[PDB]
């Protein structure tokens, strides 16, 4: 029988407290029942609905999510990392090879408008935006690896995100 899979809507496995998140399954249901079974750190939820909704993410909602339907096996777990802070670098992919595109996003607590946003590599300003916008390198290069973070203004407060590492492979 096929293995179900959990999917993240939207697709950021790193979120900030009070962020909304939606998990949905990819497994067909039986004619008798269309119920879903959701787990969360092997704890078992309660609702049988096809999508699991986290309105206001707390730190207790981090961990391993998995699901299963009538005509599927237990899904492989997907990790959700709920961080605390003002800013959080988010990416669609975190693994990079030579000539891959690098898409980076500076997500803010409750989608608050962000201004004078700077993306820094290795402690130096690399790209600046008057208004919160995404950072995008067309085709990676071995020199684009390093520690990255983003800072800007949350209405007079000057705030920073935690740094992430970014290595470029192959070549």
């Amino acid at each position: 029988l096929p293995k179900a899979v959990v999917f993240l809507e939207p697709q950021w496995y790193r979120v900030l407290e009070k962020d909304s998140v939606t998990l949905k399954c990819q497994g067909a249901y039986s004619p008798e029942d269309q119920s879903t079974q959701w787990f969360h750190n092997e704890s078992l939820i309660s609702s049988q609905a096809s999508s699991y909704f986290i309105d206001a993410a707390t730190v207790d909602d981090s961990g391993e999510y998995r699901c299963q339907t009538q005509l599927s096996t237990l899904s492989d777990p997907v990790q959700l990392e709920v961080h605390i802070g003002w800013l959080l670098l988010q990416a669609p992919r975190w693994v990079f090879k030579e000539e891959d595109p690098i898409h980076l996003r500076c997500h803010s607590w409750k989608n608050t408008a962000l201004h004078k946003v700077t993306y820094l590599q290795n402690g130096k300003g690399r790209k600046y935006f008057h208004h919160n916008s995404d950072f995008y390198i067309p085709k990676a290069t071995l020199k684009d690896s390093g520690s990255y973070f983003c800072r800007g203004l949350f209405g007079s407060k000057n705030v920073s995100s935690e740094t992430v590492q970014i290595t470029i492979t192959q070549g």
Binding site: I84, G85, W109, T112, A113, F154, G155, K157, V159
Partner: protein, 213 residues
């Protein structure tokens, strides 16, 4: 007042005089500004060198003109605690903050240095005016917490101003204090006194007089 980033916190040391005299009460004060009217609860946690303390006193929220709030918490400290270098920590919790705000304060670090205090009579050429300037030079002291007062025949001479401490070339501080008096009082033979308070002075106090001589 869009108040996007939520409140701000400011931590304030005790006034120098309050920590130099046993009969006075020194206090650390944590002020929270920009507190929204919608989400206004403010929780204060106080740590003394990393240990929680609960004898602090929280003032009621006050409405500012910019329609924000102002919450104050004051922690009275022990004289020896402040003078001995204990660290003081304010932790502020608010609904409009992602994590609590933490600020710490303590007496500046470094070997205290005793102040030399010197009384300087009015310049010759100032004696042609109807008011005169008694000067008090307090140099060579560390740290910059210091108090200076003026006094004549027991009663406190008030018509005076003291400059902020200034950094010397040897890392110590110095300041000046000026007392304006009417020339007659200086010409009589009255005595005036600069009083200085500092931790590195014997008995936290020295007095230097100045008179026609």
């Amino acid at each position: 007042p869009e108040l996007l980033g939520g409140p701000s916190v400011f931590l304030f040391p005790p006034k120098p005089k309050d920590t130099l005299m046993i009969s006075r009460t020194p206090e650390v004060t944590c002020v929270v500004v920009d507190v929204s009217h919608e989400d206004p609860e403010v929780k204060f946690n106080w740590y003394v060198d990393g240990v929680e303390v609960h004898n602090a006193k929280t003032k009621p929220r006050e409405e500012q003109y910019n329609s924000t709030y102002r919450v104050v918490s004051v922690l009275t400290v022990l004289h020896q605690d402040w003078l001995n270098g204990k660290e003081y920590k304010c932790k502020v919790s608010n609904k409009a903050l992602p994590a609590p705000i933490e600020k710490t304060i303590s007496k500046a670090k470094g070997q205290p240095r005793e102040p030399q205090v010197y009384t300087l009579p009015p310049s010759r050429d100032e004696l042609t005016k109807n008011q005169v300037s008694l000067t008090c030079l307090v140099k060579g002291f560390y740290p910059s917490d210091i108090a200076v007062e003026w006094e004549s025949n027991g009663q406190p001479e008030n018509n005076y101003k003291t400059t902020p401490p200034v950094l010397d070339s040897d890392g110590s501080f110095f300041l000046y204090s000026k007392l304006t008096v009417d020339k007659s009082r200086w010409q009589q033979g009255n005595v005036f006194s600069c009083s200085v308070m500092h931790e590195a002075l014997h008995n936290h106090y020295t007095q230097k007089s100045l008179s026609l001589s």
